[PDB]
């Protein structure tokens, strides 16, 4: 899997001019160092193995911090369960790495890291906690409380994680409706028409194919409420596998503003350096 | 028999240029029909050939000295272009490749350079703080196209927020630097070198066929990399003409006509 070896090149006095080209043609001049300067024979023992797409994407990346609480009812309101719509677009790094390409098709491997802590200095005593992470696909019922009937998870996939164990980990296949995931969608979901009763029938967001694209995850504690408040956070780590990508794009140069390609705040991404200053 | 002299013929139309650079086929793929192992809909597709696959000429844009750039979206630029626009509006699904020909002639005493970039899924940034609020009427300008702007003028009207784009020219309207846009399929119209550019675009999408009215697959952006200069005057302006021919056009699901509210 090694790189091509450098060929020996002597002096040249010829009608062939590999140095001159025209970038107006859209092609890049495929020169080797033997075509401009004299070169010795070098055998290359270097490889592009870690520059592959799989090696570029085989890292874990945090995409959500889901906060759940476990306390008995009081005058102050409580957050007994939490729900997160599945998207990668709210953290900048994995979104920037995925937005090098227009279309992608990968298998997917989630990992859940759960940490809990107290908030009251008076007692500090609580038992071990068991966390339920239920996948809710689009259109399926969503929980209205931490103890209602949707948590019975008859058809929905569910992970029961006990605290202190090794982090929970599952694989998801390619679930997308198209033959590739579309990172960028230059279009609308609905077209406003001349026969519409008002403009709000056909109005839709630009660059948004579907709302609730991949479903939501629900996190709760299955235990009864301890007398003191225990605040837990579930960190979700994305790792693409078997990754195939198409149509390379330039990376993002300005700070992200929402799920679209909108820019607002900085727009000044290059510094000052003089023309004749090294 | 040099590559500077080129003849393109499609249907009843023919383009001859004597100072081309070359022809770029985007990603090495010529346009093709759907083969049987990729066909998702079951209805027999309409392939009009000659009635749709012909060169259509848009409005000429005037390249003044202080101009910043122009952009178009396909197939939206051909929404009024005869039987292709009619077949686009009478059908639910459509697939076509394109041949984009940009014409910009100037004398040997003129100088300047244009970058003709072909961007798949050319999303453009909004004009205001409300994210992704750009309307369908402003996002689809048709054959008129749009223009780039030299700065983000933040639109802040209390009522009627205009729902437009604000494509910043060095940011290509999408937050990526203009110098890195050469990974898109591209040709440069350098006035000392060539007067025309040809890019052949295959159908690029995550689906085998898609709605052409809802979705624009390709975007064409023309930006002056070097500004236009002439001998000691400021009023110089030369015309730029963009010509697009659909290729391997096919349309699957027939229904009554679409009348969008522009």
């Amino acid at each position, epitope marked *: 899997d090694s790189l091509p070896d450098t060929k020996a090149s002597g002096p040249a006095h010829s009608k062939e001019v590999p140095a001159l080209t025209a970038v107006e043609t859209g092609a890049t001049n495929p020169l080797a160092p033997s075509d401009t300067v004299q070169t010795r024979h070098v055998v290359q023992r270097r490889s592009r193995s870690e520059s592959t797409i799989e090696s570029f994407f085989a890292r874990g990346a945090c995409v959500a*911090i889901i906060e759940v609480d476990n306390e008995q*009812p009081t005058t102050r*309101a*409580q957050k007994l*369960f939490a729900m997160w719509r599945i998207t990668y677009k709210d953290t900048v790094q994995l979104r920037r790495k995925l937005e090098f390409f227009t279309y992608s098709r990968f298998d997917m491997e989630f990992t859940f890291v759960v940490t809990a802590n107290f908030t009251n200095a008076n007692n500090g005593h609580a038992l071990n906690q068991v966390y339920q992470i239920m996948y809710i696909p689009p259109g399926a019922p969503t929980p209205k409380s931490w103890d209602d009937y949707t948590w019975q998870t008859s058809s929905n996939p569910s992970i029961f994680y006990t605290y202190g164990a090794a982090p929970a980990r599952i694989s998801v296949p390619y679930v997308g409706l198209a033959n590739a995931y579309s990172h960028f969608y230059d279009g609308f979901a609905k077209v406003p028409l001349k026969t519409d009763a008002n403009d709000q029938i056909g109005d839709s*967001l630009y660059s948004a194919m579907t709302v609730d694209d991949f479903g939501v995850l629900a996190v709760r504690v299955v235990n009864d409420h301890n007398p003191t408040k225990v605040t837990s956070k579930v960190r979700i780590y994305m790792k693409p596998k078997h990754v195939r990508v198409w149509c390379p794009r330039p990376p993002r140069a300005v700070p992200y503003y929402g799920p679209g390609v909108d820019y607002r705040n900085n727009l000044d991404p290059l510094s000052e350096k003089g023309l004749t200053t090294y | 028999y040099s590559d500077r002299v080129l003849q393109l013929t499609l249907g009843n139309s023919t383009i001859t240029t004597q100072e081309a650079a070359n022809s770029v086929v985007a990603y090495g793929r010529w346009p093709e029909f759907i083969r049987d192992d990729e066909a998702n809909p079951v209805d027999q597709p309409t392939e009009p050939d000659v009635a749709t696959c012909r060169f259509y000429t848009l409005d000429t844009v005037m390249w003044g000295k202080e101009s910043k750039g122009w952009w178009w979206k396909l197939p939206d630029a051909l929404r009024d272009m005869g039987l292709f626009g009619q077949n686009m509006y009478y059908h639910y699904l459509g697939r076509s490749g394109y041949t984009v020909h940009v014409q910009c002639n100037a004398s040997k005493f003129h100088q300047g350079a244009l970058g003709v970039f072909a961007i798949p899924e050319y999303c453009l940034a909004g004009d205001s703080d409300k*994210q992704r609020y750009t309307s369908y009427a402003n996002a689809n300008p048709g054959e008129r196209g749009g223009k780039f702007y030299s700065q983000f003028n933040k639109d802040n009207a209390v009522t009627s927020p205009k729902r437009e784009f604000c494509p910043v020219d060095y940011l290509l309207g999408c937050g990526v630097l203009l110098g890195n846009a050469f990974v898109y399929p591209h040709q440069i119209i350098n006035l000392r070198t060539n007067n025309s550019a040809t890019i052949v675009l295959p159908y690029v999408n995550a689906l085998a066929i898609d709605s052409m009215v809802k979705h624009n697959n390709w975007g064409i952006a023309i930006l002056p990399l070097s500004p236009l200069d002439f001998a000691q005057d400021s009023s110089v302006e030369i015309p730029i003409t963009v010509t697009i021919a659909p290729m391997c056009s096919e349309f699957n699901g027939l229904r009554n006509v679409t009348a969008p509210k522009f």
Partner: antibody, heavy 124, light 108 residues
């Protein structure tokens, strides 16, 4: 919540909203006004945990908001007032947490704790 | 401000739906749709916090739903103590918040 409990035309009017210390440091503080029969109207947000302030687009120039950690009080100054500003002005604490994760890193909060407010008349 | 009907009326024992229609973003994108109750002279009281969810102490005759750009509040089994104003609340994009126009409910 103590809302401070005013009339003059044109000149600037200052407001006060004092809360308990845990709710002051932990939760955001919002301002809502209500003209008689004209419905509710949002004014802005003070977050004393990080001193970040967001103002409504109708009120982005006229309204300035400060925080005070010593007496656990927030203050709002309307720098110039007009005759339409004759209204009942409320202070609200964002205490009710939502199930839905805001972006992917935060928790959204509605208000269910409201002050009794104060009435300001802008006329001679 | 979000559109609401100005006044709805009904006799006791009836079922009454009050509708709050916003726009794209707003009710249609976010699930941060809320409802408030205001009797004359009183502070506003939260009656529905998330779209279909009720706070503690709110009676079960209140209910809510979302159908798109429109969120509806349904009161089933109307009582005379339900007379007053109802205000819709939702989250708009770029982190601003906007109330509804308000609906006066009169128990006939």
């Amino acid at each position: 919540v103590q809302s401070g409990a005013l009339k003059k035309p044109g000149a600037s009017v200052k407001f006060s909203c004092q809360a308990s210390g845990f709710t002051f440091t932990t939760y955001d503080i919002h301002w809502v006004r209500q003209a008689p029969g004209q419905g509710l109207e949002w004014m802005g947000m003070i977050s004393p945990s990080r001193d970040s302030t967001i103002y409504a687009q109708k009120f982005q120039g006229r309204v300035t908001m400060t925080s005070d950690t010593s007496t656990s009080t927030v203050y709002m100054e309307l720098t110039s007032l007009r005759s339409e500003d004759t209204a009942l002005y409320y202070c609200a604490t964002a205490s009710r947490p939502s199930a839905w994760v805001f972006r992917s890193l935060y928790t959204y909060y509605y208000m269910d704790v409201w002050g009794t407010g104060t009435t300001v008349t802008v006329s001679s | 401000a979000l559109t609401q009907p100005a006044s709805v009326s009904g006799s006791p024992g009836q079922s009454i739906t009050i509708s709050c229609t916003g726009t794209i973003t707003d009710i249609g994108y976010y699930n941060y749709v809320s409802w408030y109750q205001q009797h004359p002279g009183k502070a506003p009281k939260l009656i529905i916090f998330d779209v279909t969810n009720r706070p503690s102490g709110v009676s079960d005759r209140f209910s809510g739903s979302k159908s798109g750009n429109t969120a509806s509040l349904t009161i089933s089994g109307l009582q005379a103590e339900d007379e007053g104003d109802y205000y819709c609340f939702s989250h708009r994009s770029n982190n601003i918040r906007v109330f509804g126009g308000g609906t006066k409910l009169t128990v006939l």
